[PDB]
Structure formats: C-alpha cells, structure tokens
Chain A
C-alpha cells in the first residue's frame, strides 16, 4: 500500500488510531500536509545558513527569527499561507484531499506501481522531515543558535554529548589534553 516500505512489511499503527476508513483518510491528509510543511521547513533551516536573500541579511535565522522579523512581516507571511490554504481546493477527480493539481502532469498516465512509489516517497520524506525539523527546532531552542551554525562552531557532538567523546582521537576535549579538538566534533 501507500506509505508502507520494505523495512515495515505491514502498516505501522500500534495504537490502532486509523480504526475506520474516515479516520485513516483524515490522518493521511494531515500527515501529507505535515510532511510537506516539514520538508520545506527543513530546507528552510539549512539554506539561510548558506545564503540570505537581499534585505534579509539582518534577520536572525532560526527560532530567533520569530523575534527578529517584524510582527508585520510575520502577519504578511501568515496571510499569504492562509490565502493559499483558503483559496486553493483539491482538484476535481484528484487522488483525494491531499492533492491540489500541482504537478499532476508528471503523475498522469503513469503505471500504478510508479504512482504508489511516488506517493510513498513523498510520505517517507515528509516523515523524516518532521523528525528532522523537530530536532532542528528543539536544538535551536535549547542551544540558542541554529543547529547548522552550532555544528560549525562545536561540531556534531556539542556541549551535550561531548562528554561521551571527550577522550576520542580527533575529538578529545578532556581536561589537560594536549589538544582541544572539541570544535571538530
């Protein structure tokens, strides 16, 4: 089926939340939307570190962007998103409520296994993006800076797990060490 890959032979629903078809459809729609927003949000986290659009250089990047950007600007962004959510409806005859006739030319007249593979790839990427965006936001909130800049400054292990690897080669930050090497891991 759609959303089930090789690592899981059967559908994963330990709590049996999708007991009925209506609830399964609602959860599928919600999951698709959440995964899409999470995917764009994760690229959204990575790309401002690489570069900033003209005029957006001053603004802070991560959760700090909520305070940095003007409340008026946030209102404008939310208004754009709301206009999109209110003025766009699923295309008649579409696969469901999750589709909006955006890029459907690529999926029209294709083999059903390929359509299922595309839908499942969308869902899996959305799920990984949800997990990754929660990780990014939680780390940003806890450590005061976006995760990418934080890793550049401190590395993969920083100030929370560096204690585990304080005695490793190229990662040795133990007291009295002949080298710090804490920012390279």
Chain B
C-alpha cells in the first residue's frame, strides 16, 4: 500500500493480506444458492405487495376461509 495517513506513516500501521482467499468456490456457490432462494422469495413478496389484498377471493377461491381459534380469542378480547 501507499499509505496517505499521517498516523499510519508514523506508527507503521499495516493492512496484512492473507496468502490464500478465505472462502473457496464451493462455499461461495453455497452462499449464492441461498441468495438465489432469497431472491426468488423476494420477487414473490414484491409481487404480493404490489397486488395487495384480493377481497374477491371469496367468490371463486377454494375452501370457506378459516380464522384460527387464537385469532378468534383476540377478536373477542378486542383491542
């Protein structure tokens, strides 16, 4: 390095550099696989946020909707 700091030059502070890179190609690939999973989930989340709630679902969607018993208890308790 060509240090430009007065304190660095005075005290001889150094930026030690390893001989070998910390992570290997396989480790970087695994991290990238996890990042890809994150990206897919994030795209799905962005789509959901963009489209918001769909109150029409009760007209065509399968099932009859459900409220968890704890959610019902919270509703009964109130705010």
Q: A residues within 8 Å of B by Cβ?
A: 50, 152
Contacts and interface: CB of A to CB of B under 8 A. Distances in A.
**From DSSP, what is the main secondary structure of chain B's interface residues?**
helix
A152 B26 CA distance: 12
Contacts, number: 3
A50 to B, nearest CB: 7
A29 B29 CA distance: 34
B25 interface: yes
Interface in B3-38: 25-26, 29
A64 to B, nearest CB: 21
Contacts of A50: 26, 29
3 contacts: A50-B26, A50-B29, A152-B25
Contacts of A152: 25
B64 to A, nearest CB: 17
Contacts of B25: 152
Interface in B27-55: 29
